[PDB]
């Protein structure tokens, strides 16, 4: 159909290729992001396809700034590109304004980037969808940026394989008054509910934004929530 | 065909059929002959007539006091290549006051024609050229083709109906080396007459000649000038 | 479909059942009607019922049946279909998803598609033997169709079939539950309210699913709970999610 | 099926990058395996040297390369694409060495190579390079690293890995070696690699048929093992 | 093929791609600018429907270009975002040159010309965004303008685009109000049109996003409505429909 | 082999420019005669409606005081080529102060024409006749979209080119006076091309070596009308 | 047909089948061979004659790369001429920059990159030629490198390109190039070329020889076979 | 080789995409301009003001010079684009040239812009045609027409758009070779056609007048209805 | 034409699925490798009775299959 080219409309006014990009999304590894009352928790799956792959040598949760965390559901290299771009954009905002960039501004800048990859006749959009967790002026923010160049506000969401299960789960088992620990518990619970196969320190990785600072939990902490809990 | 749209696409034969189609476009042009001796290098062209009240088109060009050409191809490509040789001989005379050697000019022609043959969306130069010159190393006759190949030929003929002329040149190659200017030019005129149908023969309308020598600047003789060369030459009996 | 059914009674039934007025008026009878709406909105049902009451014959050919793999075959099919209809006394011709052969073709083979739609238009335009002969056309999402058939001398009228509303959902649920063994304590109105934007066919679906829930449990009776879990299976639009739900085609 | 694979920057209905998997085929390149193993103070790569004709000079047909005095690289792919990729590795290593004042880490170098491969993946201007590269290096007091870098733009570090003709057999053999508790010496690591190659290939393994590169914390120079060393290891595993 | 590229007309001379862009617009969340005097408004019910959507901006359909200028969105999301940003830079250009608020029609032109220039080049996609502007300027004051993907623009006292656009504009023409039709009556009529066009019974406050421009102190103020006034207006329209029933 | 000039046929011919020759054929007819007295050009307007200004259709033009032109084809870019010819004459004369040889003017127009596949569009689908005088000879020249160009004594292009060319060939000889050439060309145009001569559809322009003024025919046709 | 239409998309069974078409073009050309003797490198090439029209010693296929670097080619002739031009450019670049003669490994690898990078881009095509480069560095050794249309560069003791790759390699395998010196290497090369279809079906051809050796000063020269024609006599004695 | 493009010819040699542009002009509303004894008048039809659509905004008539005036029939986006370009060109010419603008130069400008835009790949032609009336023909009126082929011609009176077939014949029926005395008579004559084309509703005659010395003049609907009533009196004579 | 025709094929299958007349006891059986595709018109309740998932055999199941075949 109208998919071999990106810069032409369909008779129904549908950009078909970008929905193929969205179909590439949700085919990747599952991931879930939830806004608690205080913190913002993004959990993702990191099972190694074999014992060859070193679970302690690679990461998927990435701090763009000391108050911004990024998680994704898509092929890795495009996520690396957009992480590099987001880090440089946050640093350039810091240079311009001498202020740490708030969550919404960085999110809209990255969305504008993912936009600029949605035109022309010799390129393709990123096949990745992104959760951005951030702290801004004492307020926690969770955002989703998707290959179309648009972005959405979520107190909770998930994508990847079994993502509809995640939507149902966070619809049932969630309230915005969640404490941080119960929020991470909900995150691992929805990760498992979407998951297939065992989950331990080596299989999951999570990142928590708190207004003082954002940090990616160590595999040991991911196990402490992951095992002996739930 | 699947593999015949651009020169960038190879064929399973190990060939580029578009280059061969450029060769055929060259073959579409009228016949031209080139031959050299130890005294002179001469080229002659069969000026295609357009009507009894229109000028028979020029097929021999002059670009240098010691260098000349005879063309067979799309006139635009050949004449802009002619401007290219204008540029190079003029800048060489600027650089070191040297009449540009024919061999290096022909090599530059081939190298420049090579660029389209390996890039998408740009036609290789659909003309065949015979180049005559005299230089500090010898007399020179070269032929260049859209495949960017360039050759040195003691005798050569390119264009339509050329096969008879090429065979005639093969026969009289044993002569040309020590032949004088008059002998060489008359043999070249007969080489051209070999191409023509039975009812078509050498006349000032269809014939153009260009001569370069160790003692004369390369000059193109047309119209009245052709008359003394043809007069006294043997007519064609049936 | 009471409003739609009334319009189609007028346009179809009146010339066939009472031609004398059109003789007294002198005006030639209207030829056909196009029906457009989301798929499953009772278009074929309405045409079939109209043919049944009008007592004339029902002949059907979907647009997808017309295409064929050879040139000169759609024209033959259309012409011989008209021959069949004429030979079959008063008759209504029904063609479902006519848009399949009527659409944007100026883009550019495609030749036989035009040679078929033009032939159909020629058959209807020449009012060929139209003594009690009528045609009915059906389309999903009218927009893809082309005006070549709707041009004034050609087919005369259009009827819209929006998704059933609360009252329409009430009817359709009642009609398709009339044969099923229902139980006291049922509250079908809550069920109709719980199914916003049904296309009518999926209400036949909800009745079917409630009965399937009864059957797989070997029960020959249905209850409120059975229908309520059926409707969950009938949602199927929860498969929209982040993709294009509120972005792009928001 | 046809249509979403004629050009690179096209997503399939399922979102599959056909040309990425399609370039993944040329990584086969029947003749090399590139098994790399990490030991407690060492990093070892061994590749299989399939020479089709005798008249070639043995040194020229090598497939192991160096970009740092402490970094070793090995290749599995189309040889021309191979040499271009390693040349880009030299380019990046030299630029990092000039800019930062010290040589590039192996993880960052895999990241850069995978970044360029991803760049050609995302853009239709240039074909992705049909080759897979493996790096061994040392990082300060913290350990030896083995890294695999692929045309998809993906990269990861491993206890051991092998992108070769016997893909699943070699990978499962290395998993079996590592899924049983044991120590890791230099000779033990080289023994594991050589046993993997010999068992998955089942060939008698004369010395000229394989080439070994290595790095070790005690002697962090990247070295290609001479034929004497490799034959000593061959007889060590043989007896 | 003709419709595969933006540079090709029909043999009839029409351009399919812009038509496809308005068909795309046909999907958009219903949004209108109402007929009013001494004030203007641009109501835009948010089509986003999920209880877990956080709406942290309280506005995703109305974007304020200046405290006397606002514009809506009906079409592609990323295109609309970049286009509204570009509106802001063009208004900033005009203001930074003249230090004077831009006339409505001039900004409308500038954007529509930029959009047309993007469409008419090859290798580029036409913007599938239709959008409405409400503004006050020195030349004409209160103005509401329509713009389409092709770069067309027009003046409309009341208009609507999105889902059921034809129905909304038709009923606005049916119950057309003029003259004494001041701002509050425009809020009431917007409530009526949003109730009619949408399928929801008892229209919910979070589903709708409303904004209005009123000339305060000659400096102008543009308000994006909060929950309380929206609830009051919708409940008042419900009881007004009940009152209309009371006549029976 | 349909996308452009950069594709060659099995016989070598480019399947783009022959269509430009046929685009010459769809234009209005045009005639040119070379005589030792003066060089003349004629052209048919195809005035769609006399409510138009007949002079508005610039199918007959003056490049300079010594050189005039006519064209047949799409016309639109023919005016661009006339613009190039005029700028060529202006620049060359203002720099060198020697008169531009009409051969050189045609050469410059050809150099412009060779800019559709020779650098880095499409061939100019129009053909031209130039008629000029110079210090060395009075000449007439012909130009076609391929960029090649030829000296001719009696030339015809556009629609009905073949029959007009045949009659023009049959009437021509090398010692004609320009009056007899003009009358023969006009009567040929009357018989084959459209109809009897009138000021709103025919155009004539002639040039002589010693005359840098009024290279046109205007508001004097009446003598011909009664005496043709 | 499939997806083998340009050299920028991996065709099925990932091998592009495009640069393999370039290799098919290489096979069409006549044979060239290259040997490394104990202290020198020699190249021997046969070239077709156009006709009796053709001028003797024209369009020859040996080419000068550098004052000390020699070239032999097979495949498309004009592409080989362009390759000789770019190779000369690269040699001049190194000569001007480093201030001393380029090692042949570096130059060969750079030309291999030129060919390879030309294989990738969609607007361009892989070279339809394959070639050998030879040189001698009096400081440390002799050097020879052969490059294919794909960009693969390898070294040989004896190598061959053309319409007789493997047959010529069988001819070369039983020479003693392990210790043999170049003066009889030229005779062996000439007779080897004449052995593989001298004029069996193709009527006439010209034989050209190139040399780079310490006894040759290590520079690039065309072997003076005009001296007593010993290699010519040996090659024609190859009759039986 | 079928059309399928802008810069290619069918074997006949005509650019069918230019034909498609002229048909795109044909689908537009009526536009009939004339020149009189001294003055030039114009009246545009098919306003079709739909209630909230206040008719002023679309600006069916645009005056872009110290004195010149016309909009463009076709698709209005390119009309406004050429409007911006005409503004820039007229002001720049008046600033840069020793003497102010003339109608001939600006018409040649529009034609050249249309031709230049058309003469390239990937660049859609302006499917718009226009009728330009100007004063400085040495202080005389003259009328020009511009066609998407980039062509410009001169008319005493011309019609383009939906009435092109009809109104032109109307002109051929009654354009007096007598120079129109009482240029209000020419205004009545043109108003007759401008009305009769669109059902003579009397509501969409939106009209401008310039006496070749004046600046832009406009006619309000009542004052235009005055000429309409005079034309009705002239037509009622047949009794 | 291939794309249009395959769409007409699936639509014609839909009309036949809903079209077969009562008292006829035909059963349409559907096989598929993926089923994350498949348009939600076969999954419509009025056409789909049961969706049966056929996994790759696991332990126990592999034991049963080996025993049965051997
Ligand atoms: N109002 C209704 N009452 C009863 N049954 C209905 C109604 N609407 C739809 N249906 C059921 O759904 C089907 C609708 O088919 P139809 O609308 O013709 O499909 P399409 O839109 O593909 O032509 C009918 O066969 C009928 O059984």
Author numbering:
A (entry chain H): 5 to 234
B (entry chain L): 4 to 241
C (entry chain C): 154 to 261, 265 to 406
D (entry chain G): 6 to 244
E (entry chain I): 4 to 251
F (entry chain K): 8 to 127, 134 to 241
G (entry chain M): 5 to 244
H (entry chain J): 2 to 240
Report text from the authors:
The 26S proteasome unfolds and degrades hundreds of proteins to maintain proteostasis, regulate cellular processes and generate peptides with second messenger functions. It consists of a 20S core particle (CP) capped by one or two 19S regulatory particles (RPs) that gate access to the CP proteolytic chamber. The redox-active thioredoxin (TRX)-like protein TXNL1 is expressed in many cell types and was proposed as a nearly stoichiometric component of the human 26S proteasome. It uses its C-terminal PITH (proteasome-interacting TRX) domain for binding, while potentially reducing disulfide bonds with its N-terminal TRX domain but how it binds and is regulated remained unclear.
PSRpt4 was not previously observed in structural studies of the substrate-bound yeast or human 26S proteasomes. On the basis of the locally refined map, we could reliably determine that only two subunits, Rpt4 and Rpt5, are ATP bound while the other four Rpt subunits are bound to ADP. This is a strong deviation from conventional models of always having 4–5 ATP-bound and 1–2 ADP-bound or empty subunits and again suggests that ATP hydrolysis can occur further upward in the spiral staircase and ahead of the large movements and nucleotide exchange of the substrate-disengaged seam subunit. ADPs, thus, accumulate in up to four subunits, which may subsequently allow several subunits to move from the bottom to the top of the staircase in rapid succession. The preceding PSRpt5 is the most abundant and likely most long-lived conformation of the hexamer and its transition to PSRpt4 is linked to two ATP hydrolysis events, suggesting that the movement, nucleotide exchange and substrate engagement of Rpt4 are slow steps during substrate processing. ATP hydrolysis and phosphate release appear to not immediately trigger the seam subunit’s disengagement but instead accumulate strain in the hexamer, especially for the PSRpt5-to-PSRpt4 transition that involves two hydrolysis events.
